[PDB]
Amino acid sequence: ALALYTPLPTPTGWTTMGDVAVGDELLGADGKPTRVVAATDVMLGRPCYEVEFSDGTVIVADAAHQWPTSGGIRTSAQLRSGADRIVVAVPVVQIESARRVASVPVRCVEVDNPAHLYLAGRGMVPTHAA
Ligand SMILES: [Cl-]
């Protein structure tokens, strides 16, 4: 799950996680549109992490949100400064830090591509859907 205020790129522009509904198009890891097949209610009180990438993108996500790295899938709580790079399909960004922060409301989406990936944050960082 990602914070409601997380900007997500779409084929036409930018939406927030809070504004995502079933049937909306996000972008998959290949930069092409992918359809939202499910989207949770707002979830409150989840432990959250602030994940900062080498491109300047900062995403707040719950502790168990999953990220594709070159060494494996890692949750936000397991991400390591420097040691971890986001990799798809080609290196995308490096993890600079992941730190526990105050809880904010979050939501999960599921998307219709088999990799279960979509782009998130102003830098369009690949991340795993539920
Ligand atoms: Cl893995």
Author numbering: 1 to 89, 106 to 146
Please share excerpts from the published article on this structure.
We determined the high-resolution crystal structures of two variants of the class 3 MchDnaB1 intein (MchDnaB1_HN and MchDnaB1_HAA). On the other hand, the variant of MchDnaB1_HAA shows overall weaker densities for the second conformation in gauche+ for Cys124, which was not modeled.
The protein-splicing reaction involves the self-removal of the intein and concomitant joining of the two flanking sequences (exteins). All splicing domains found among inteins have the same structural architecture named HINT (Hedgehog/INTein) which relates to the C-terminal domain of the Hedgehog protein (Hh–C or hog domain).
